[PDB]
Amino acid sequence: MEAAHSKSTEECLAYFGVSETTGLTPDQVKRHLEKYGHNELPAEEGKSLWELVIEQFEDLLVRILLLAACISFVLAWFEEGEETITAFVEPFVILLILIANAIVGVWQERNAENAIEALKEYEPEMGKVYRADRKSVQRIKARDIVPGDIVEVAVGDKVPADIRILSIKSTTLRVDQSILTGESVSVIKHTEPVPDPRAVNQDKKNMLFSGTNIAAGKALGIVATTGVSTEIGKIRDQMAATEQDKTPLQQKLDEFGEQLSKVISLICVAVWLINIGHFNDPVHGGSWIRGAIYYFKIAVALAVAAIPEGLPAVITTCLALGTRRMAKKNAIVRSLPSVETLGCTSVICSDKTGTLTTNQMSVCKMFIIDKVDGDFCSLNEFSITGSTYAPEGEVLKNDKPIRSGQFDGLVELATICALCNDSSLDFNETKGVYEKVGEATETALTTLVEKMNVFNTEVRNLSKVERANACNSVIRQLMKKEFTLEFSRDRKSMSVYCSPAKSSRAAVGNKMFVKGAPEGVIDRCNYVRVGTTRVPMTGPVKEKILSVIKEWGTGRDTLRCLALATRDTPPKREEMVLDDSSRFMEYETDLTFVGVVGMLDPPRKEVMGSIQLCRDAGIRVIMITGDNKGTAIAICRRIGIFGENEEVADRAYTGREFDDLPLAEQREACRRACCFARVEPSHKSKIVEYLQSYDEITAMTGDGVNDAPALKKAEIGIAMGSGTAVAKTASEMVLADDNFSTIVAAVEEGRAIYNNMKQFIRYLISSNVGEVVCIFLTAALGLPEALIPVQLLWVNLVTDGLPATALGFNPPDLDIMDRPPRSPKEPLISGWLFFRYMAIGGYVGAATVGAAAWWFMYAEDGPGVTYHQLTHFMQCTEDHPHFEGLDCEIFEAPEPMTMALSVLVTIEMCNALNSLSENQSLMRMPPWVNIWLLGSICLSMSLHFLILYVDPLPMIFKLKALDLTQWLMVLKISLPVIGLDEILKFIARNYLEG
Numbered sequence: 003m004e005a006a007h008s009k010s011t012e013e014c015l016a017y018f019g020v021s022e023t024t025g026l027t028p029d030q031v032k033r034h035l036e037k038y039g040h041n042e043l044p045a046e047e048g049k050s051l052w053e054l055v056i057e058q059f060e061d062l063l064v065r066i067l068l069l070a071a072c073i074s075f076v077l078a079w080f081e082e083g084e085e086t087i088t089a090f091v092e093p094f095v096i097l098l099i100l101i102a103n104a105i106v107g108v109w110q111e112r113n114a115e116n117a118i119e120a121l122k123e124y125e126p127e128m129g130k131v132y133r134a135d136r137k138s139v140q141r142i143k144a145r146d147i148v149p150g151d152i153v154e155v156a157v158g159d160k161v162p163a164d165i166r167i168l169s170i171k172s173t174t175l176r177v178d179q180s181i182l183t184g185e186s187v188s189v190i191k192h193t194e195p196v197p198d199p200r201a202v203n204q205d206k207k208n209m210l211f212s213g214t215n216i217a218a219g220k221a222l223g224i225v226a227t228t229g230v231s232t233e234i235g236k237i238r239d240q241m242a243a244t245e246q247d248k249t250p251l252q253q254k255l256d257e258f259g260e261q262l263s264k265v266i267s268l269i270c271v272a273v274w275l276i277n278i279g280h281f282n283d284p285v286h287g288g289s290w291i292r293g294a295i296y297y298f299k300i301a302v303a304l305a306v307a308a309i310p311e312g313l314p315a316v317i318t319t320c321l322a323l324g325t326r327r328m329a330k331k332n333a334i335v336r337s338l339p340s341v342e343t344l345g346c347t348s349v350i351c352s353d354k355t356g357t358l359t360t361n362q363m364s365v366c367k368m369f370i371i372d373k374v375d376g377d378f379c380s381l382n383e384f385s386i387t388g389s390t391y392a393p394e395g396e397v398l399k400n401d402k403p404i405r406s407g408q409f410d411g412l413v414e415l416a417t418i419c420a421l422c423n424d425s426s427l428d429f430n431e432t433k434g435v436y437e438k439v440g441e442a443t444e445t446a447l448t449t450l451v452e453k454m455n456v457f458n459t460e461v462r463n464l465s466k467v468e469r470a471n472a473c474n475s476v477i478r479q480l481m482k483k484e485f486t487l488e489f490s491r492d493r494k495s496m497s498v499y500c501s502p503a504k505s506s507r508a509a510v511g512n513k514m515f516v517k518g519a520p521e522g523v524i525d526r527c528n529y530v531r532v533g534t535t536r537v538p539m540t541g542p543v544k545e546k547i548l549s550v551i552k553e554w555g556t557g558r559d560t561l562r563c564l565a566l567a568t569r570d571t572p573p574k575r576e577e578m579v580l581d582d583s584s585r586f587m588e589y590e591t592d593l594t595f596v597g598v599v600g601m602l603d604p605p606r607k608e609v610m611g612s613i614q615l616c617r618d619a620g621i622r623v624i625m626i627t628g629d630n631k632g633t634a635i636a637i638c639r640r641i642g643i644f645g646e647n648e649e650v651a652d653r654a655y656t657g658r659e660f661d662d663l664p665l666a667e668q669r670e671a672c673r674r675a676c677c678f679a680r681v682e683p684s685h686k687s688k689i690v691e692y693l694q695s696y697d698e699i700t701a702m703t704g705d706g707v708n709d710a711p712a713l714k715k716a717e718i719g720i721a722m723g724s725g726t727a728v729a730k731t732a733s734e735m736v737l738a739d740d741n742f743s744t745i746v747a748a749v750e751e752g753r754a755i756y757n758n759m760k761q762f763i764r765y766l767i768s769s770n771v772g773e774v775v776c777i778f779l780t781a782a783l784g785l786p787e788a789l790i791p792v793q794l795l796w797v798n799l800v801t802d803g804l805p806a807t808a809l810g811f812n813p814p815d816l817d818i819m820d821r822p823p824r825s826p827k828e829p830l831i832s833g834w835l836f837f838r839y840m841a842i843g844g845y846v847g848a849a850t851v852g853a854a855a856w857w858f859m860y861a862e863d864g865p866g867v868t869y870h871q872l873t874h875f876m877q878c879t880e881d882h883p884h885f886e887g888l889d890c891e892i893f894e895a896p897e898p899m900t901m902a903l904s905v906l907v908t909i910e911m912c913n914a915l916n917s918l919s920e921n922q923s924l925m926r927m928p929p930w931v932n933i934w935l936l937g938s939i940c941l942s943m944s945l946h947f948l949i950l951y952v953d954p955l956p957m958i959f960k961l962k963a964l965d966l967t968q969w970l971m972v973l974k975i976s977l978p979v980i981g982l983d984e985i986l987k988f989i990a991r992n993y994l995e996g
């Protein structure tokens with residue numbers, strides 16, 4: 003039964019065919035359980051396992067490197083040399099990375115908790131039910147409960163399933179629907195049915211939702227839906243259906259891996275095409291086994307050269323340091339990639355109360371009737387000081403302090419605000435300041451009564467805590483609080499029946515004091531109050547009242563008006579049906595207008611400027627509120643979303659309007675609108691769907707499980723620090739202080755990371771690009787192998803890793819919030835940036851190969867060999883006459899490879915300095931700006947010396963120590979990289995920046 007709320011208690015029992023006395027029979031229990039199923043949310047199956055490791059080895063590039071691991075292992079064992087400990091290093095270090103890199107990708111245990119599993123924490127263990135097999139009540143597993151069961155609930159008990167209330171045994175039943183409403187006010191339930199079939203959950207005054215807990219009372223009911231059919235279940239299935247897409251950067255890195263795969267496979271064939279001359283060679287000259295060794299050892303060496311295998315570890319460390327940086331600015335980011343994608347935030351949908359406002363409710367203005375006489379009508383406006391729940395303030399008329407006790411209308415004003423009120427103030431000892439109890443609105447009314455002091459009670463003689471509820475307590479002494487009529491969303495008001503105490507205060511029998519929506523309550527007023535006297539509610543007066551109501555709500559004041567009326571001669575205690583909620587409408591009719599109070603929900607202290615930041619940063623901001631459209635628009639004008647004087651007719655919508663519009667116009671509305679009022683529960687997710695259709699990275703916010711579906715569906719799920727765990731588990735970011743400013747503060751930081759992160763990306767790939775050029779040149783010309791894969795890996799991991807990670811601490815841009823959000827379809831490298839790191843990379847290939855060739859041909863301590871025979875070194879012992887110098891070990895010497903490797907490290911430290919900025923010269927920004935970069939470079943070069951000196955190392959990398967005679971040549975060939983980059987950067991700022 004889905005629409006059990008719109009059915010009578012007799013109908014729900016007739017449908018399931020159940021007896022309210024004995025309940026379901028064990029025969030029905032099996033039949034219902036087999037038809038509907040167990041009352042429990044489905045445990046998340048199809049989880050991750052060893053298969054999650056397989057997913058890391060799915061990409062094409064990772065398979066290439068994996069194949070390089072297998073090919074390397076094949077060439078390892080099959081060899082003549084007896085290199086013992088330094089043989090299986092090539093296959094070993096490959097697995098070290100393939101293991102480490104795979105562990106980073108499988109890392110989804112400590113940095114992302116499941117939201118649906120956290121949602122299972124709201125379903126209780128056991129529940130009370132009445133089965134026909136026994137007399138007294140019997141509790142069982144909540145999962146054993148079925149639709150039709152006559153369940154029982156009391157105070158403290160957590161509701162097992164969606165229950166249709168049958169009968170309330172206690173005086174009144176209260177339930178804390180905080181998880182499904184957000185408003186932590188214990189709502190009151192009833193037995194009578196709700197006429198609307200498609201009524202919202204808040205309107206369901208006769209339902210007990212699963213996950214909800216009873217705040218007070220005890221009642222018996224019949225189970226309508228169970229498990230996935232419950233309100234919690236319907237929310238769960240929405241989250242289980244929504245698939246979280248990968249951040250735009252992640253898609254580009256995957257897209258890059260595909261491009262780099264084509265590059266490797268292309269050159270592997272290109273190398274084979276260059277050696278097409280071997281097809282025209284004799285059989286009696288060399289062997290296929292000698293050739294394949296060079297081809298295979300080239301492919302594996304070419305694979306590691308192109309791949310930036312150090313990148314993943316570099317970014318993970320950067321984002322990890324980015325997480326601690328964001329948490330300091332009050333922004334608890336959950337997932338690592340979320341810190342980067344946060345800068346790409348295009349839209350921000352935020353809630354008014356709590357986030358945009360301080361939620362420090364306080365009555366600012368209040369007007370009553372001064373006198374009515376024919377066409378003439380005069381009011382009496384006032385103003386209140388003290389933007390807080392504290393009583394420290396005063397009332398004044400027209401910027402002049404007054405005594406509210408001398409105004410009869412204001413006396414009854416405080417009377418209604420005191421009696422018709424469930425909230426109260428409370429002084430705190432720990433913090434040392436007044437606090438609120440109940441609703442924010444009603445607490446402001448309590449504070450107002452304390453400020454007014456209409457009876458002039460003692461004030462200075464009272465203590466701090468004792469006077470917290472002084473004037474209000476004095477008011478409660480006059481009238482007795484018989485009973486209150488609950489606040490319903492259909493009439494939007496609250497009244498209270500009050501009988502006079504044994505005091506004789508001119509009390510004409512019993513009275514009712516009503517408060518609620520101005521436009522609604524004023525209509526139910528046939529009379530009007532003028533001090534002590536009464537007059538008939540005429541047109542001119544009704545205009546003057548509603549006009550001032552509109553002036554306060556639409557004006558710059560942005561006040562939440564609240565009309566206060568009273569029923570002079572209410573019906574007797576007997577005639578009033580105390581249970582009928584719909585009858586509260588006529589019980590609050592024939593009222594007499596007393597006055598009105600205008601309160602303000604003051605905006606945040608920083609939102610005034612934070613909104614302006616979004617305007618300059620090209621980020622759109624969409625407010626979502628519960629206030630009326632007129633005031634919601636006025637509030638937007640005040641904070642900065644709207645201008646003081648501009649069009650907003652089609653840029654602002656209500657929940658009522660948005661539904662009436664067609665599907666296409668709803669999408670057309672979401673692209674321009676930025677202010678939604680009276681939003682329905684399903685609107686947050688709908689709006690996000692329309693924002694995602696425009697490829698806009700959206701950031702929706704929420705606090706309860708009602709928003710969970712919208713949060714998880716959004717790119718950047720924004721949750722409150724005070725929100726429920728389900729919201730914080732479903733959110734990508736959690737605001738620690740619940741502020742829209744800290745929302746933008748994190749967005750600004752996310753952009754800064756994007757710049758510094760993308761900087762060391764082009765830095766590392768630029769390194770790998772030159773490594774490929776070194777292999778392609780040393781292979782095409784047929785030179786002695788310039789570099790070895792065992793070396794390159796340590797170069798990309800440590801040598802390039804330390805400085806690359808240090809580039810994350812680079813200074814930000816002063817004009818970062820001036821540019822618009824980064825486009826999701828924006829590449830890492832393009833056009834000029836491609837050529838720039840292509841030339842810078844292409845040079846290192848000639849630097850490394852040239853450094854090695856330098857030792858072979860024109861060197862100091864090296865054997866003078868010519869270029870034409872140096873390219874045919876593989877024919878060592880064959881062509882003896884041409885090769886007449888030293889042992890064949892000379893071509894396989896450690897010196898030349900050390901020259902190529904040493905040059906690679908030297909230029910990389912220099913290229914790291916070139917990567918301090920994108921185009922800014924080293925003259926403008928010195929290389930000592932980033933302190934962490936210098937420290938990493940000192941450590942990088944320190945490690946470069948260590949692998950050469952400490953004997954246990956140089957034998958492994960096939961390298962030997964270099965003296966000043968050889969090191970001087972390294973600086974001569976390496977340092978020119980800075981001058982080249984300086985020329986390139988100069989061309990960018992001059993003949994390109996336009």
Ligand SMILES: C/C=C/C/C(C)=C\[C@H]1C/C=C/C=C/C[C@H](C)/C=C(\C)[C@@H](OC)C/C=C/[C@@H](O)CC(=O)O1
Pocket residue numbers: 058063064067103104106107108251252255258259262309310311312313314317318321338339
């Ligand atoms: C982009 C943001 C991702 C977040 C985190 C926390 C980790 C990612 C970082 C991704 C690196 C991608 C690099 C592209 C190059 C081309 C690929 C390799 C060197 C691959 O090795 C050949 C290794 C891929 C590792 C990732 O799958 C692990 C991961 O989650 O890292």
Ligand code: NA
Pocket residue numbers: 246713714715716717718719732733734
């Ligand atoms: Na999400």
